[PDB]
């Protein structure tokens, strides 16, 4: 019975939906989508559909497996599959690309802009391709596909794959008898008459566990929350002025991360973290443990002056709220007035996960003893100093 | 610094 | 066409969702605004279309036409087609006092959607019901009181003059023919559709489905478990929501902004700076800001001495300081200090940073980079530069 | 069409889709799918369909309910359902699994790779299984049911379940009489002739609002954006070269948070935020509002010196781009040259959301008046000072 | 600091 | 600063 139309259209939508899924994946079974590895602006994939079958099949396809054949293998069509049957017979698919640098997959050189899957019409009368197309649109709606961007085309080989020499919208083919016949008037034997299928997913379509289904533009990913009847959402917006995308988390009160990295001027950084530091008694260098950096980043450090005086060892600067400063050591060992200052140096070296910090305060000469921690014109690793330590990681 | 603080001088 | 069974369940499932919501696109559900105990909705389904369509619908959208509007059917939609033809829906309401929405005067008790049979032979309504219910169960729906009925007008809507359960029509041939004998052409034959969603719900591409409270969105990882999921939690005492990413080891962003005390900021990034020879201002390129934020800068003192030009402070681990320039051209000891100024001005994406060290007079030459009582843009200085962006 | 042709095929598809529904769910009625709880690589489910009926049936099935009889119970087939009827008679289902560690559900120990459901043929002539299978495939397309392979098979009892001694694709069985007749010749008395309906669990599986289904390794959660055909995605990656998972947001231009916290050395942190500060005229102490900390974190503060001189009160440092410094007050009240320096102290105490900040610049003695804001050897809360104030929160 | 800046001295 | 650092003085 001539409901083989509907059944034929079912197969057209089934195959096209799987091509769309494949076209939406950057990785398939933990390996780069092979079609993304090249850099040409167009590619046509053959109608035998080996490029869409798994590599581990009785005949080997082009779609990668993991390597362990006990794992679950994501797949698209069965390996004995063939869609070059029926009145709408699969003729191949036209991929159009733009170049793309993937932030985490150096193997990817392009991104897909559009995929068109062609089904040549082998019906008995060529003017009935319109009727057949009506069934594909119906089957599309049944699987959540828009069914609003269809056209009938004539295709012939190009230097690369094929090109559409002429096209007419499905709506003009059905409603415009003049345009219809003018189109059919071009359907010579050198060209191939075909339905051109570009599927767009309605908002009803389910999100898939491999991620091939993208959220619609301006839609939000939301959670029910114990705020009751409130839902807290995030979304990825694009701003046409400035040409930038934003991950908007501002509807949630706090984003709580563990490790966190970001970029400044192409370089990767961790947020600076700060401590209040003083040297302890005895003129000995200060050891500060280095933060553990994310892999690929390296430790940075900076010390900045908060409080100082020329008392050297005769000081307690360890409280943030008060400073104890008892003056400068004199030649006879007594504590005198505070000498005048000429410089402060803060130095730091990273050796084996430890920042070794040293400091010197330069003061007027002729006051300090000849020997000791405070001697000559230098107060070495003085207590009369407080600094803030900033640590971060960068590349 | 408390008000006991004092320094050397150029006078 | 051959999409009739899909359309029957699609339309019925959207009508059921409408009936389960008190609000649609931030406005009160128009059907709840009265208190009549029963109401029938027209078969043309204009009442289910958005108001912002060529013909005005009755379902509210947000007043703003930017973001996506929750909708139930398309505006050109017509479901009064096919062998099972949408005939309208009979809503039953109960009186209900709203705890927080004064516009709602009633609550929904039940919705039944009728699809009129337009086939020439009525005995096939059983098969047609079978494809409808098969599509219902495939979508996670249980049919409620699934029945084949004959309906004729009433005061408000319609009433079921005769009915037979879908199960009796298929399993009891006598009741079937008895019912079928009653189904004359003068009467209207109908499928009565009441759906209850019994299966769980898939996340949808329009974002209309929210994750359940306390659920985790997870990725398979070769790391195993407990490090691959994220979630949105609620604090009941402090009335705060948290996007909990702490199961992931590192959050890796490109641009990053956060809020502090009503202002939006990017993280401070720091550089180690010294002036080169020659006493010129130092140019530091301003970072590129996110849209709507502007450049900020601060320089703070790390190391200094009074050597001025006679210094090299560019190593972080040691400082070379060779004293203050004397007027007789020689280098003497380090003179005593009176001040340090660090200044910065933004001009055409460059921060021009200048510094001065003020020192005792009567030591430096009368002219030059180090002259009078000033060391101008001295080398005997290392400062930390902080940059960030804010609104 | 809304009329049933084959009524056996109608029943086969119903049972077939409900097996499809069951296999795609990790949870049923708020509980783990029973078939995921074991660790065997293969398991065969009986033809009586006990394993598919609800636990609350008069006779107990294996499918869990919510325990609460107030809730709606998700169900697959009715309690009195029996599919061992008709020319194609349900014979059982062969589930094949792979081992699996679920990221958040320890009750799940395996994942389904494929389900093969068997329908033994009981028609008078063995070759008509071709026709009956054809009605199943046709009825499937009419009902929107997508299986991944249809085959005619001979099965024999096993130690565990069954195994397929022989199989032939539905297409070769109807198109190739030689393969067909050779196949039927293997249908000895110990074997069962059957239609094999094959479900393959792929990446198409729907993501559930309860989070019971995980994204595949390295898959991307994507948004359509107004850049047109551009897609903006995020994902959770694992890099074994450092044994760390990464929430990769680098495809999006800006991550925009409200509150933000991260970890450094096991401690929780908020970013450091800075203000440029000077004291008001008159030597009065400085007040700075403490930032709001997330609950469970505490306020921290540090002030670092940016500019200073010994001018005391005779100065204005409030502009970031220029400094006005008019010398040190002399004993007679006049403004003299800038005195020499011996120290700077910066002090800060938190009192009820306010940081009280004081400062002192120590200078050479014998120059200042005996009393006043600038007196002895001290310039109190001086205007001849600019400091950077850093705040952050920590636990 | 602008060029009017001057200090005390040890000369 | 290394131990060669020295400054002017008020004495
Ligand atoms: Ca570098
Ligand atoms: Ca700007
Ligand atoms: Ca439930
Ligand atoms: Ca096949
Ligand atoms: Ca034979
Ligand atoms: Ca403020
Ligand atoms: Cl103090
Ligand atoms: Cl200035
Ligand atoms: Cl040094």
Numbering used by the authors:
A (entry chain C), D (entry chain B): 29 to 423
B (entry chain I), E (entry chain H), F (entry chain G): 1 to 11
C (entry chain A): 33 to 423
What did the publication describing this PDB structure actually write?
The toxin-coregulated pilus (TCP), an operon-encoded type IVb pilus (T4bP), plays a crucial role in this process, which requires an additional secreted protein, TcpF, encoded on the same TCP operon; however, its mechanisms of secretion and function remain elusive. Here, we demonstrated that TcpF interacts with the minor pilin, TcpB, of TCP and elucidated the crystal structures of TcpB alone and in complex with TcpF. Repetitive TcpA units form the filament structure, whereas TcpB displays multiple functions, such as efficient pilus assembly, pilus retraction, and CTXφ uptake. The structural analyses reveal how TCP recognizes TcpF and its secretory mechanism via TcpB-dependent pilus elongation and retraction.
We then analyzed the structure of TcpB alone and in complex with the TcpF (1–15) peptide. We used this TcpB structure as an MR search model to determine the TcpB and TcpF (1–15) peptide complex at a resolution of 2.30 Å. A structural model for all six peptides was successfully built, except for residues 12 to 15 on the C terminus due to the disorder of the region. TcpF (1–15) peptides can be recognized by clefts formed by TcpB domain 3, forming a unique hook-like conformation. A unique hook-like conformation, in which the five N-terminal residues of TcpF adopt a type I β turn structure stabilized by pi-pi stacking of the Phe1-Tyr5 pair, was recognized by the TcpB trimer. In forming this rather compact turn structure, the bulky aromatic amino acid pair got embedded in the binding pocket at the bottom of the clefts, with its N terminus firmly docked at β18 and β19 of TcpB via hydrogen bond interactions between the Phe1 amine group (TcpF) and the side chains of Ser373 and Ser388 (TcpB). The electrostatic interaction between Asp3 (TcpF) and Arg408 (TcpB), as well as the stacking interaction between Tyr5 (TcpF) and His366 (TcpB), further strengthened the rigidity of the turn structure. We speculate that the C terminus of TcpF (1–15) may help their NTDs efficiently come into contact to form a symmetrical trimer. With respect to TcpB and CofJ, although both their domain 3 structures adopt a similar H-type lectin-like fold, the length of the β13/β14 loop of TcpB, corresponding to the α4/β16 loop of CofB, is outstandingly short. This difference in the surface-exposed loop in TcpB makes it incapable of accommodating the elongated structure of CofJ T4bP-SS, which may explain the lack of binding between TcpB and CofJ.
